[PDB]
């Protein structure tokens, strides 16, 4: 759950508690955790019993949060609640470097986001691709 | 049908309403369609009374909503907790006679409250891209 | 829509008070940067980028890696000059080398058991009769794996390695009995095979039923410990069932058609002489009946003591060829400080040790992001060109980082199981169960950290999260605003917009719609004073700075909010100290936590919780398995004394198992539990081999003692044959030294000691048990 800018106290008292109020009583719930950090982001991880069907359990979580998607702040709602059967460690960490220094780090991250991350995600068996580098963007540094 | 998997059937209903969640009025949509595998009768009816009359009914309902309903819902086996009592809230009983007397409309009072009582995004002092030469980063806070 | 800096800089902008139409470049430096500058990447000290690929739920690691490497090779062709692709962190190579090492040890087990059976029969034929049942039983196990929805992992493979020495038991029994009949009576292969069948058909079935029923309850255990038991259960049980089907169906045909007439070095007289000395020693033993039962009571006592006292673990750590290094700098730390810390750590292991590649991610870290958090995935050079081990390296990094750069850098090993935890060790969650508030929980937390600093079984039990930090809350004096005549909404706008970095809309940049972010320039949002230099329009027409209407105040508050099972909590990582198991640390943590303020609870999460379940259900798995074997035995031999005599041999196998574990210095992990049950089964096998024939000879009219000694002597050869077979088949597990060798060490040491015991201590005690239990009734 994203809620940009807002510090962790706001995500903790306005968002996480709401979702956690529905996470209970889910089928085969082994244990559940929720961490809100300073990036204006909360990760609520419901860990189910070992061997439980991850698909149907993911469905159960979707159903429970559906009952709490109308009370979250407007930004949270119109920013989406990405619910995914997740993992902890990275399988591998593909990267792009520039030994001749012909491209600054921003150009490498741009190229990686625009022409690599999509085609990496389009591989069978790749569940998530987290890009540690942001796409290019027209920045307007105003001067107050 | 009796004995049908309530989970997959709930999923089916979710799918069917997904095809009709884009035509409903805007309020309906941005108020959410809470789809839940439901029940008819209450298992039990927890309540809070005040025999010494030290707390009015509004205070009891407030305490019940703020410190009981959440922890009741956080019990395993509790599917829904319907609170027959509303949380406290700052009520502004306007007087349309005086509203007209000064020349204002309730829309105005609505705007005055929206402006004198705003949620100011926190921001972060020294967030990236940092100025070469910074060693401290304090998360700012506003209070409006 | 604008597409170039030129069009953006010339964006008109009406000037509020004067009238001049200014451009955007007058009030703002327009430039192309990145959407958000959250994370950075240091690959081998150089700035670069990266893309962490998280495996799909239940996908294949090796296949996914094959696909991603192929896609990288494909995309290499379209890389402008200057860009180079790299995989500076990859785990599936280790999956490929682990599964290959396990298949290699499986083949080594096959070869060694074939050599043992050849040495005990001396004809390729006689030894080929059983050695054809192992591959067929294994292939049937594979078909059942597929039909049940299983996979080929190191767990089921380890189950097959254990099974190699158990599959061929039945066939060894049949071939030994047929060989023996053709040696003593000289009968033709066909009718000799028929007589051997009419003799040991029920022994074979009994051994089978016992071995397949001892492995059933373990698969019923709950939790990951069960998901681990289920592999070994399915593998070994189906392997034993197919081994029995073959011993009853295929090996009789082989023994009937392709067994050549006995015509045909020193082993023969020495082995027989050995058998005779054993028989005389057995008679001397049976003499002192009560003393040997006293020695058995003593051994059971020692065994129970060891199984109750020896430290417990869950899974052995392994040198996966790489490790992680989490840098947690205090709050108020800037990305420059974390770059300094990471640069120090990167330069600390740059040319001194032998590592393959060290990649650091700035701004990202398991359990929290932020400028003051980095995670560096140093990948060890290799295993064949190594010097210091993963655990010997991490220790070096920890000690060479705790004293130089400010922070919390703690190099840590990869976990045991892939998606259980991020690091090796235990992970506890200190919960706030009585609404004590955050400050109380954090005080309890640092106290617990103070108590864990002087413990010997603890090393660094740090906090896996973000630390408290100073915030700058602004109080707005509304009365001063109304007196100055300034709208409040304008002050709110100015603050929020002055810090926010808001995003507006997109623009077409080289064919792709990229964002257009606006934000107060860097040098105007760094220190607090800059904020207090913002100005708003008053009532009298003159500007009023924010410093006159807002008052800052510095609070101390937690910057990350963690919740567990509903209640606020704090993730407390920890790794046990050298010479201390994970079980001891867990128990020690419980005591420490018991020494904490009231209302503060504690919960185990991940590996710790799974380990707790293992330890809390190891008694019922041994209580239920033993009872199942007893009941099956009583059903098979229609008595209550025979199954007691067969059960009385289990503590001897456990005895050796515990002895081996204590001597080697391993722990009471789940692999040892797997061997514990395997040795129960094999012990029962060695006992039945004697007890059945002794019962038959006693029913044939022979005296109890004479029947007992005759059956022991006649079945010494199959017992030793099968025993040495399984022991030499597991020797590859104990002696393995490559990569992923610690799992094999833990899984083989137990069964090795247990088999050595349940064969050297069985052929002498099972006759004693039989005679005693039958005389006492």
Residue numbers in the entry:
A (entry chain C): 47 to 190
B (entry chain A): 95 to 238
C (entry chain C): 239 to 502, 511 to 1023
Give me lines lifted from the publication on this model.
Upon antibiotic stress Gram-negative pathogens deploy resistance-nodulation-cell division-type tripartite efflux pumps. These include a H+/drug antiporter module that recognizes structurally diverse substances, including antibiotics. The superfamily of resistance-nodulation-cell division (RND) efflux pumps plays a key role in intrinsic MDR in Gram-negative bacteria. These tripartite complexes comprise an RND transporter in the inner membrane that acts as a secondary active H+/drug antiporter extruding a vast spectrum of structurally unrelated drugs through a periplasmic membrane fusion protein channel connected to an outer membrane channel factor across the outer membrane. A comparison between drug binding of AdeB and Escherichia coli AcrB is made via activity analysis of 20 AdeB variants, selected on basis of side chain interactions with antibiotics observed in the AcrB periplasmic domain X-ray co-structures with fusidic acid (2.3 Å), doxycycline (2.1 Å) and levofloxacin (2.7 Å).
For structural elucidation of this RND transporter, we reconstituted AdeB in Salipro Nanodiscs sustaining a native-like lipid environment. Here, we show the single-particle cryo-EM structure of trimeric AdeB in the OOO conformation and in the L*OO conformation. A C3-symmetric density map could be solved up to a resolution of 3.5 Å. The AdeB trimer adopts mainly a resting state with all protomers in a conformation devoid of transport channels or antibiotic binding sites. All entry sites are closed in the O conformation, and an exit channel is opened. In the O conformation, the PC1 and PC2 subdomains are in close contact constituting a closed cleft. As observed in structures of AcrB, the closure of these entry tunnels appears concomitant with the opening of an exit tunnel in the O conformation of AdeB. Our single-particle cryo-EM results in this work show that 90% of imaged AdeB protomers remain inaccessible to substrates from the periplasm in the O conformation. We assume that the high prevalence of particles in the OOO conformation is not an artifact, as similar trimeric conformations have been observed in another cryo-EM structure of AdeB29 and a crystal structure of Campylobacter jejuni CmeB43. Whereas it is not possible to discern whether the L* conformation is recurring in the postulated AdeB LTO cycle, that state appears to be the only one bearing entrances from the periplasm in the absence of substrates. This would allow initial substrate entry in case drugs enter the periplasm, since the OOO state lacks substrate entry and binding sites.
